[PDB]
Amino acid sequence: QTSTSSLAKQLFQMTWPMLFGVLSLMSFQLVNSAFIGQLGVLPLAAQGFTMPIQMVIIGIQVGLGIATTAVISRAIGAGKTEYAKQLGGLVIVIGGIGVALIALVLYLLRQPLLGLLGAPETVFAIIDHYWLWWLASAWTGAMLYFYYSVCRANGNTLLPGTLMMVTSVLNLILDPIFIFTFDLGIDGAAIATIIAFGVGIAIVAPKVAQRQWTSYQWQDLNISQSLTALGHIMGPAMLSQLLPPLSSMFATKLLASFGTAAVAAWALGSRFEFFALVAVLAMTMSLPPMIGRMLGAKEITHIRQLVRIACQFVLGFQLLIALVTYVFATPLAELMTSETEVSQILNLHLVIVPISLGALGICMLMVSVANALGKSYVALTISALRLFAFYLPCLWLGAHFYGIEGLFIGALVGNIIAGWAAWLAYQKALRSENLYFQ
Numbered sequence: 001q002t003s004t005s006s007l008a009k010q011l012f013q014m015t016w017p018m019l020f021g022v023l024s025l026m027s028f029q030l031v032n033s034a035f036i037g038q039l040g041v042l043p044l045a046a047q048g049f050t051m052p053i054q055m056v057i058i059g060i061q062v063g064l065g066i067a068t069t070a071v072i073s074r075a076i077g078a079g080k081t082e083y084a085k086q087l088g089g090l091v092i093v094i095g096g097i098g099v100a101l102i103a104l105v106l107y108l109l110r111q112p113l114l115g116l117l118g119a120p121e122t123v124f125a126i127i128d129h130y131w132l133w134w135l136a137s138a139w140t141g142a143m144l145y146f147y148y149s150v151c152r153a154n155g156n157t158l159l160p161g162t163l164m165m166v167t168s169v170l171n172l173i174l175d176p177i178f179i180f181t182f183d184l185g186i187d188g189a190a191i192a193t194i195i196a197f198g199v200g201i202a203i204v205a206p207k208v209a210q211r212q213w214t215s216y217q218w219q220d221l222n223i224s225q226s227l228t229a230l231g232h233i234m235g236p237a238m239l240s241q242l243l244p245p246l247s248s249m250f251a252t253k254l255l256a257s258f259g260t261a262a263v264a265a266w267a268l269g270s271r272f273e274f275f276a277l278v279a280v281l282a283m284t285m286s287l288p289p290m291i292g293r294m295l296g297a298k299e300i301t302h303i304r305q306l307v308r309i310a311c312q313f314v315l316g317f318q319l320l321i322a323l324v325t326y327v328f329a330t331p332l333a334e335l336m337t338s339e340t341e342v343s344q345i346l347n348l349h350l351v352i353v354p355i356s357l358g359a360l361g362i363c364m365l366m367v368s369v370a371n372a373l374g375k376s377y378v379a380l381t382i383s384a385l386r387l388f389a390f391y392l393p394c395l396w397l398g399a400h401f402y403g404i405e406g407l408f409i410g411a412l413v414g415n416i417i418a419g420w421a422a423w424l425a426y427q428k429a430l431r432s433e434n435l436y437f438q
Contacts, residue, residue: 007306011283011313014290017161019282024168026274035175036189043186046126049119050134053106055245060102061142063238064095065149066288067230070372072153073289077296085215088150090226092214095146096139103135126186133190140197147204152289154213163200171196233371236380240367243387250392254399254407261341262404268336269349276321276354280314280361287365288372295373300435307369307426314365318358325354345404352408359419366422370429378429385425386418 037044068091075084106113110127119127144167148160171192178188208214248270255263274281287310294303325332329350333343363386370379394414398406 003302004305004309007302008309010290011286011306011310014155014157014286015279015283017158018285019161019278021161021164022278022282022285024165026278028168028172031172032175032189035179036186039179039185042120042122042126045120046123046130046186047189049114049117049123049127050131052117053113054138056242057099057102057106057138057142059241059245060099060238061145063241064091064098064230064234065145066237066368066371067232067234067376068146068149069153069288070233070292070374071229072150073155073292073372074296074374076154077293077299080296082215083221084154085212086218086221087226087230088153088208088214089216090218090221090223091150091230092143092146094227094230096143099139099142103139107131107135130186130190133187133194137190137193137197140194140201144197144200144204147201147208150208150213151204152285153292154211155289155293157286157289159204159207163204166203167196167200170199233374233376236376237371240380240383243383247387247391251395251407254395257399258404261339262345264337264339265342265345265349268342268346269353272325272336272350273353273357276318276325276357277361277364279317280364283310283314284364284368288368291369291372295435298436303435304430307365310365311362311423314361315358318361319355322355322357325350348405349408352405353411353415356412356415359417360415362419363415363422366426369426373429373435375429378425382422382425385421390414390418390421 033044033047036047068087072084072087072091075081075087110131111124114124114127144163148163151157151160174192174195175189178184178192179186180188182188184191248266251266252263255266287306290306291303294300294306329347333347333350336346337343363382367379367382370376370382391411391414394410394417395407396410398408398410400406402409
């Protein structure tokens with residue numbers, strides 16, 4: 001009886017610092033957009049065309065972290081102590097060089113990239129000097145995140161969780177000082193980020209080295225086999241990241257047919273989703289290290305128990321959020337926007353979609369769990385199935401025959417099927433190979 005209780009408590013202590021960390025980031029990024037917005041239309045338009053490349057940088061970013069968490073934590077479970085810290089140092093290296101190359105390429109090809117996005121001619125002039133500072137903030141942020149991945153892989157989410165809160169507060173304070181006081185404008189937004197993340201790096205890196213989680217003594221390390229182990233998970237994981245923006249991207253091509261108010265409501269509605277799913281998002285970062293470590297230690301019974309405990313939480317916890325959002329949908333929508341036409345559409349989104357978020361959370365959880373078991377291709381399938389087989393077809397059918405209301409209903413049944421399909425893929429993955437014999 002203690003076994004279930006012990007696992008449930010281990011999961012909670014592992015997840016709650018990740019949760020407060022995730023909440024800190026999204027909170028600041030909202031306040032940061034308000035700060036940039038006070039500069040003018042053209043600056044805010046410049047930040048708008050930067051988000052596409054950000055989601056790609058972040059896509060590559062967490063793709064490596066997922067591989068890092070899975071490969072390293074499993075080595076610890078197997079008792080491969082030295083191999084675990086050598087990999088830690090290897091991740092920091094390939095992440096540092098790889099992201100530096102992307103950032104270098106992105107800046108050189110800015111003029112064509114903004115062409116495919118079709119930006120105003122004035123926005124080009126802002127990007128020329130903003131992306132220099134911003135891509136530097138992107139590299140710095142990726143590095144800090146890589147240190148976090150090494151911490152989580154060693155069973156520590158408290159330290160990255162704590163530093164995410166510290167890095168957000170510092171970023172919040174430096175924002176008005178560098179943007180307005182020092183009068184740097186939009187550049188001050190990126191500069192405030194480099195310093196906030198740099199200070200985060202200054203704290204975590206000595207701590208990680210102190211516990212010998214990173215090593216650069218690669219004298220007895222098979223580089224090619226180690227890069228194969230990482231790349232095996234990293235490969236499909238990045239592709240899995242390229243799909244969720246396409247869920248909201250392709251949805252805005254459909255949206256434009258119903259006016260400028262339907263689009264604005266969906267931007268707000270989908271923004272609510274991320275906050276309504278922070279618990280699952282945090283669990284996506286705390287569950288893989290536990291699973292990966294147990295897989296190496298052949299604790300297969302506890303893996304099944306933990307995943308089911310985590311599944312029961314997500315299903316029940318998102319049911320409550322759905323219920324709360326349901327009864328308070330009208331004042332919530334009117335609080336999120338003062339545009340009456342936008343509020344009414346958003347009102348409909350908050351009583352239809354949120355009840356499906358428990359199913360979508362399961363889908364998210366299975367993708368992260370599948371990756372932790374080394375099943376990166378099983379994970380990619382679930383992601384691709386969710387997007388092209390269920391979500392997009394259901395959105396389009398509802399939008400074609402029933403308009404904005406049908407589109408929301410489509411999102412509902414699309415998430416329910418996805419989550420139920422994600423669970424079955426998981427069950428099938430356990431029967432494909434006996435985990436007791438690797």
